[PDB]
Every structure is written in structure tokens, then in C-alpha cells.
Structure 1
Amino acid sequence: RDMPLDSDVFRVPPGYNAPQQVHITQGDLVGRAMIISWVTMDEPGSSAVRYWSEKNGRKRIAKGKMSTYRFFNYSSGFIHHTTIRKLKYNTKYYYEVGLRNTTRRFSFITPPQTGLDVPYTFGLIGDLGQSFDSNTTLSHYELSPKKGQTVLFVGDLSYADRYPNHDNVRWDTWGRFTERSVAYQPWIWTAGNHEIEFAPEINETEPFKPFSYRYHVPYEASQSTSPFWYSIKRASAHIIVLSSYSAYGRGTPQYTWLKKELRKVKRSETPWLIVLMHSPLYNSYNHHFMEGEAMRTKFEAWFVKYKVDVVFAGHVHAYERSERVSNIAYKITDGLCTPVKDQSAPVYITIGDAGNYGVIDSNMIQPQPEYSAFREASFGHGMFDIKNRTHAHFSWNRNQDGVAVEADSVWFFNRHWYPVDDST
């Protein structure tokens, strides 16, 4: 069900050496910087970006960097990444890319300054891929009357690794496909397993190669040493991104980084604390059942201890939302190994159902365990709408329903400023 190469969605912008595959993300810790990235195929081109705010129409120029990579018998085009910094909060900016030959213009809006009661609405997309189903989820998102403002992406971007020799073209088409959204609003990236791409057979053994060339993140903003785990703050939220497929043993860089990072969250500043990861810690579908155990045994207590609000994951191609549950009492022989309701624990949601290559995970653990509050095997996307320092409303819209039909919906009460039972 992968959309064919000629699909209107994969068409290449016309013009000589016209910037294609345009995409953006936050470029700093707090909201006033963006990383613009794109690809030119005819020749190298300029890595300069021109931008100006709607109000103070003064045109400034940011100069970035260019790179390329070869995968097997494949060779990328010219990848560019430029970071515009020191933007003003809450203002619309226009940016142009492809200055030398054919220029293209886009716009984005900086978020509001970080604050306790600042509202903001995030979209949740996981496991997109490029099937027709993928196309549908993306439009439904684009049409959600509750306008999404940033997409928190949970992993498995294009599934190009399913093609022979991981046909990296499929990375190009995906990038062209999603530009309609990412050229305009940032998508926060998380690495999934389809991004690992360990292919000894074709002599490609550096994990995450294509993904890392194409998608950049402000990892040094948090003091991370790798782009696979980082953190950013935006509006009233503090987002922490983790890498299920990187290492988390005690003492490793990721473990060490997260320990420090959790100590840096200030709920008086960013009330909402969200964590993103690919492989779900709590999952009742048969597929990938219990894979999240190892990371679970390692970070769960931290999450309960710092009161994280939600934990979004993907990987299982279906939907599921749990109860605030914890299972942090086991000591091997004491037999205390059963998830228990805990109002300090975060809610674990899994939205890996945006489409992939058109396949859904339907078999599930029967009967629905206690920790599971709702599960459904349908394609869709989610929206996490922050309202106050106390309220945030989550929704799940199915691809079968109309754009405005929330097939599941829930209010979240801030584990810090209003820890009442939302566990309903």
C-alpha cells in the first residue's frame, strides 16, 4: 500500500536546483531558534536562508552547512542545515531557501515565551511511513479544527529500509511527501527501529546513518552528547526525547544524561512534563509484547518520582491509552510484580498508528488487562492540547471518522499543580 513513486504527493518542485524536502524543528532549548533543512539535487547550491518577520519586514540572512552521504550504491543530494537564532517569540516569520537558483518561500511562527499558563497544541504522530493511509492521517491532521502547532514524532519515519538495499530514494520521497506540514511547523524527532538501518550485508554498519544526515536536532541545547536523546522546552511544556535503541545501562551517556536532566525540570516554569520514546513501556498488543521491559526496569521509577505527565510511544501499529499505573515494587523474590494504580505515575499512550506501509497490529492480549484503559487497532493521529497549568486535553481521531470526530478523548490533570484522579 506504499504510494507509488509517481504519486502527486512525491512530485518535485519545478525549477533548476529547486530546494526540496524542506523541513524545520526547534533549534534551541526555549523556542527562539529554528533549524531549517533541505535538499538540492542539481548541484550544491547556497546554504543561506533569508528571513524576516511580518512586522519588522527587515530581511536578514543565516548561513548554514552542506553535507552528503552514500548508502550502498546510493548517493544523496546536497543536504543543507541552517540554524536561524535569536527570533522573537510569538511572531510570524517568512523564510526563503534556494537563493542562488530557484527560491522558495515558507513561514513559521515562533512559540510564546515559556510560561506556567501558556497554552499550546501538539499533534501526535507515530510510525508514519508512506502508504496511502499515511497520506490520510497527515490530511486529517492538517484539518483538525483544533489546529496543531508542533508535531511530536514518535519514530519510524519512512520505512525505506523495507526496500531492497534500503533504497534511500524512499527517504527522498518521504521527505517530499511530508514537506507540506514540516516546512511550516516543527516536528520534534525521535528515533525508531526503522531508523537504525544496520545492514552488514551491504556493508552499512553505522546505525542511524541516513536518518542522522537528514534530520538534525538541538541536542547540545540540553547538554546531550548525542542527537538521539535530547530535550527542549516549548510554551508550558518540557519535552524529553529518549532512544530505545541506543544504550541506557547504568553509567552510559544516555542514562547519565537523563538523570541530570530530570533534576533540571522546573514545574513552576514548564508545568507540563512529556517524554517521548519509540518502544512503549506499557503495551497489551501481542506484537512487540514486553519489548519495553528493559528500559522500563531502568527508567520507570524516575518517571514516577518526577511525576511525568504523559509518555508517548509508537512501534505497535495501533492505539492504546493506559491508567496511571506503576510497577516499581519488585525485588525478585518478593512477588510484588503487578502493575498497580499510582497517581504519581504518568499515563502511557501509544500512537504508532499513523500508517506505516499500510498494516495494523490487531491481535491483542486477551483479556484487556487492568492497566490498559482503552485500545483500538485503527489508523489515526492524536492531539495534546494544553490549556492551563492544570488542564490539558488529549484526543485521538480515527482515520475512518470525520476530521472532527474524536474517537477517544480525555482530560489530563497536571501531576504537579492538580494531581486529582483523572484516571477515568
Structure 2
Amino acid sequence: KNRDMPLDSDVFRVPPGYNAPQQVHITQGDLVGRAMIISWVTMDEPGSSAVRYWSEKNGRKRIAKGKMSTYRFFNYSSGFIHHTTIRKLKYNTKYYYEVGLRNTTRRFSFITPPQTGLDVPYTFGLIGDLGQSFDSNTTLSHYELSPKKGQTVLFVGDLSYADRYPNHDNVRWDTWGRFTERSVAYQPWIWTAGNHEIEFAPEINETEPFKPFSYRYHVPYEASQSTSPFWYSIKRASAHIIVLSSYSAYGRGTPQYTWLKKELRKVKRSETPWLIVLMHSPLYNSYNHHFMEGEAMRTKFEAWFVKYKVDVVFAGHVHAYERSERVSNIAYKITNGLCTPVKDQSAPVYITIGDAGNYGVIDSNMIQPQPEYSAFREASFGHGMFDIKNRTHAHFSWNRNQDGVAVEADSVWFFNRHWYPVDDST
């Protein structure tokens, strides 16, 4: 069918005034929380890439300077894209920032996270495969109305679904920018790259993977000694978050592979006890759709995730909700017969959470019966929250769109794999 919100929808409205900055969004700008990448688009002319900013406390108004860029895609011309990095911020404080300093100015605000620490509580939103359908709008609306009150969104891939349109009509990137602004202009969303961001379209001489995405959404990849925007890590509060790319190389000797192997070695559980991995394609998935796609990355990375006692791996891709048991399937040796996943308290829980809305379609077909390794699964739209209480406890909840904003359809306690490695099995 067609359940994408019409161009003239209220979520798509353009901020008024000559060259008013639009599609504003922010994300963590450094490795630990002291910086922030502020981004936006101006449509009438290049404009300034300057950000004004100040804490509500100490009232000194500083000015950050950034860069402007443009891109083309087939018959589409981007507007003027700005990214600026505000650095040396104070932990745990509200900051006001402004963009569009030369003409129409707009003001926004954000709150830096506490300094990383073993016992720092923090609430992450979890959203995958958002799209811009009516379902999409409902999810975002639930998240912002959650009483748990999310401070950062971990976003597991597939943003605008703009590549489903005629010529990947990139206007549909612009709309998704203006739609998400009401959330991401005030809190970082941590970006993962999904298959709808590949935009590989040889048929119209666009053969550079990830182009529109890579122009519109910067991440702090050098911060973690990565050579690419598609894999990086950041530390925020008590969490160490590794972000991977289901669609870049991960063979032995590749950049991503090499970077990951080192990065894990840099994880200090006494400083960030919550080790979280993000990636678009799930490695454990009992839905028919995309079943076993994640098998290739699993052969390369699963054993590591276990060696390093990862707490949780979030994925999207599959348009539905799943939560694995703590299992591993890493004893296989071709001829040894050992290919069944087994209970394993060192392994992460795997969560598919790619049901935020996409283009309005849910994946309902499941392998039957439910496999031993699947703890819970349901084909409903929604988003999740991973809520860190302390060094031993994180409460994860899944909320459905058909339910009330306070209802938790599925809800489990995560016991830390380093500080409290006990059967949290449901």
C-alpha cells in the first residue's frame, strides 16, 4: 500500500523566515561526552555554519565554527548542510545553542551526560527502522511521552526509507530531517548505518555507498581511532557503545575487523560496566524475513562478543521485536557437529528492535516452533528503553504503539556480565 505521511503533513512543515535553519539534529561529538556535533540545513543560501551556545548556569555565550557542504544525487540538489562541533563542555549541564546567526535564528537546548563512571545511571531509547509512516510518527510520539524519560536514542539503522521512492527522491530525506527534529535537536541520537542507507543505485550513476546518509549525518569516528563513519564507539555515562556496519567489509584484515579487535581491548569495565554493541542486521533472528542474513557477521564476531562478555547487542532490519536468551553458537568446526546455540552466561542478549514504523509494514512470519534461543518475540510496532540503574542492573522495556505510553509489553532485568553474572534468564 502507501502509509507514508503526505508531504503537506504538520510534522513536515518548514520553519518560517528567510533561510531559517531546518532539519536540526545533534549527536555526541567526542569519545566521552564533552562535545556535541550540531547539524542543520539551510535552503535559501549557504548561511553561517556558526553555533552560538551557553549553559543556563554560567552565562558566557561562546561561538563554535563549522563547515558547510552540498551534494547531488541524480536529479536532486541538496540544500546547504552544516555540521559544527561544540567542544570542551561541562558534564551534566543544560546548554542552549542557536544556529542561523546571519538571518532567521532558532534556539534549541541539550543536556550533557554525567562524566563516565562505574555507577552512573542513564536511560537510552532504542529505535530502529523509523521511516516516516503514520506508524513512525506514533512511535516517536510514544518515546517522547515515556515516563522513563529517555536521554539519548540509540538508533540501529534505516532512517528515512527515502530510497523506496522514485530515484531515491531525496526530498524524502529532507522531510525525515524535519520530522525527527522535534526529538533529535534536543538529544543525541547515536547513528548506525542500515541497508536503506546504502543507496547503491548504479542504474542512475549513483555508485557510492551511503552518500546521502554520510553527508547528512556525521558521527565522531576519529574519536575512537576509526577510519570510517560506519564503525565507531563512544562512551556515555556508564556505557561503552560500539557501533558496527552490517554493510562494510568485516573480513580478517579489513579496517572494521581490525578496528573492532583493538577497540574491545580498550574496554574498561570498572569505568563503563555496560558494554553495548549496535548493528543493523541481527545475528539471532527467528523471523522468516531476513532469516540467517546475519550469519556472515556472526562467524567473525560472535566469539569476541562472548570473550568480552558483552551485555547486549541491539539490531533492527527485521520489522518486529525479538529478545534472545543468553546463548552462543561458537563451537562449530565444520565436521564436529556443534552447530546448535547453547545457554551461555558469558554471551550477550540479542535484541531485534526494528519495529519503529518503517513504511508501515510489520514482519509477522516466524519460524515455528519458537527456537530455544528466542526468549520473546512479537510483531508489533514500538520502541524500547534500556535504563541503567547502576553497575549491576539495567532495566530493559519494550513498549507497543497499540498500548499506552506507560505500558511495558515486554520488560526484563539485565544483570551485568562483569559485576553480576547471574542467570537473568526469562
TM over 0.5: yes
Tell me the alpha carbon deviations over residues 352-386 of structure 1, each in whole angstroms, 9 at most, x when there is no partner. Answer: 00000000000000100000000000000000000
Whole-angstrom CA distance in 2 between matches of 1:140 and 1:21: 21
Whole-angstrom CA distance in 1 between matches of 2:379 and 2:310: 26
Whole-angstrom CA distance in 2 between matches of 1:157 and 1:397: 20
Secondary structure at 1:86 match in 2: coil
TM value normalised by structure 1: 1.00
- Give the deviation of 1:302 after TM superposition: 0.1
Percent identical pairs in the alignment equals 100
* Structure 1 segments unaligned to the other structure (5+ residues): none
Whole-angstrom CA distance in 2 between matches of 1:182 and 1:118: 22
TM value normalised by structure 2: 0.99
Secondary structure at 1:93 match in 2: strand
Tell me the alpha carbon deviations over residues 134-161 of structure 1, each in whole angstroms, 9 at most, x when there is no partner. Answer: 0000000000000000000000001000
Tell me the alpha carbon deviations over residues 217-237 of structure 1, each in whole angstroms, 9 at most, x when there is no partner. Answer: 000000000000000000000
- Give the deviation of 1:293 after TM superposition: 0.2
- Give the deviation of 1:195 after TM superposition: 0.1
Structure 2 partner of 1:230: 232
Whole-angstrom CA distance in 2 between matches of 1:380 and 1:4: 21
Whole-angstrom CA distance in 1 between matches of 2:18 and 2:78: 17
Whole-angstrom CA distance in 2 between matches of 1:142 and 1:109: 15
Secondary structure at 2:223 match in 1: coil
- Give the deviation of 1:423 after TM superposition: 1.1
Tell me the alpha carbon deviations over residues 93-147 of structure 1, each in whole angstroms, 9 at most, x when there is no partner. Answer: 0000000000000000000000000000000000000000000000000000000
Whole-angstrom CA distance in 2 between matches of 1:288 and 1:109: 38
Whole-angstrom CA distance in 2 between matches of 1:106 and 1:286: 43
Aligned length: 424
Structure 2 partner of 1:202: 204
Tell me the alpha carbon deviations over residues 61-119 of structure 1, each in whole angstroms, 9 at most, x when there is no partner. Answer: 00000000000100000000000000000000000000000000000000000000000
Tell me the alpha carbon deviations over residues 271-296 of structure 1, each in whole angstroms, 9 at most, x when there is no partner. Answer: 00000000000000000000000000
Tell me the alpha carbon deviations over residues 379-410 of structure 1, each in whole angstroms, 9 at most, x when there is no partner. Answer: 00000000010000000000000000000000
Whole-angstrom CA distance in 2 between matches of 1:19 and 1:157: 20
Whole-angstrom CA distance in 1 between matches of 2:133 and 2:112: 31
Whole-angstrom CA distance in 1 between matches of 2:74 and 2:281: 28
Structure 2 partner of 1:276: 278
- Give the deviation of 1:2 after TM superposition: 0.1
- Within a 5 Å distance, the mapping from 1:28-107 to structure 2 comes to 28-107=30-109
Whole-angstrom CA distance in 2 between matches of 1:99 and 1:113: 30
Secondary structure at 1:221 match in 2: helix
Confirm whether residue 295 of structure 1 aligns to residue 297 of structure 2. Answer: yes
Secondary structure at 2:72 match in 1: coil
* Structure 2 segments unaligned to the other structure (5+ residues): none
Show structure 1 runs of 4+ deviating over 6 A: none
Secondary structure at 1:52 match in 2: strand
Secondary structure at 2:224 match in 1: coil
Secondary structure at 1:316 match in 2: coil
- Give the deviation of 1:318 after TM superposition: 0.2
Secondary structure at 2:418 match in 1: coil
